[PDB]
Ligand binder design. Sequence first.
Ligand SMILES: C[C@]12CCc3c(ccc4cc(O)ccc34)[C@@H]1CCC2=O
Ligand SMILES: C[C@]12CCc3c(ccc4cc(O)ccc34)[C@@H]1CCC2=O
Lengths: 128, 127
Amino acid sequence: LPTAQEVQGLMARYIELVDVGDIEAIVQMYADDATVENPFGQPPIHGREQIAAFYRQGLGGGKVRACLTGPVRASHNGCGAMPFRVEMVWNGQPCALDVINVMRFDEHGRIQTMQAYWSEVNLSVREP
Amino acid sequence: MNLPTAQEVQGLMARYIELVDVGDIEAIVQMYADDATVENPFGQPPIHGREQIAAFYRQGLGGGKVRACLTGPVRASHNGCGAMPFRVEMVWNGQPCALDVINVMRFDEHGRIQTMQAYWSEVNLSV
Ligand SMILES: C[C@]12CCc3c(ccc4cc(O)ccc34)[C@@H]1CCC2=O
Ligand SMILES: C[C@]12CCc3c(ccc4cc(O)ccc34)[C@@H]1CCC2=O
């Protein structure tokens, strides 16, 4: 079960994989039975295959970047929370979306749950 | 207020940090639901209810040398929840220190905090 420093490393690695759009590697980070709520408030998605579909739809068109915008906060029970900005182009408008992800890892270092907090108030038009 | 909208969550969470920054313990307590929980740091057992929460804030802030400020926007959902990054400044071992924290909060249908989870550990403390 990852220590606080191992959670910092895994959550930063997740943002690196999203930033380069490596869909297959992101899926590998999740437990085969993980659940993702993105954005939090929506019905969850459950398991690897649904999760893969999610990342393929969100990142497969390219033109998405993601970067930490502050440090990962990590707990002593395998959990942590991080702030980051997602950049995209939405029907010609360059946009930034500010997001905080909360993750719980399992005893194999895989993401068991993820909750991404954001809504449209966190979108803005902004050059990369 | 009923269940706060995303914009209302952003305002309430920002207000909470303002009140921490000036040490207004009684106003902080009034932001929580009468039976709210606080987990601070997340990973420790929850405390329950306004008196335990008041005691916790009096212990944390009552020395008067704590400041706090947002270090990015409040993220808000459409179901009355939100998350925010901020930095707390205080003294550790005789020197000025800073601690990065993220709070995740859920508001009830009266606009009061029902649950508080403050994510941080020693990996977030710097001098
Ligand atoms: C899906 C998305 C691009 C990726 C992305 C979004 C929002 C939250 C995210 C959180 C993640 O952990 C990883 C990727 C996203 C955007 C919402 C609109 C959009 O095009
Ligand atoms: C208590 C504290 C100052 C305030 C504070 C801490 C940690 C998380 C917090 C979360 C809050 O929502 C409000 C205040 C704090 C610090 C931990 C050590 C310390 O001096």
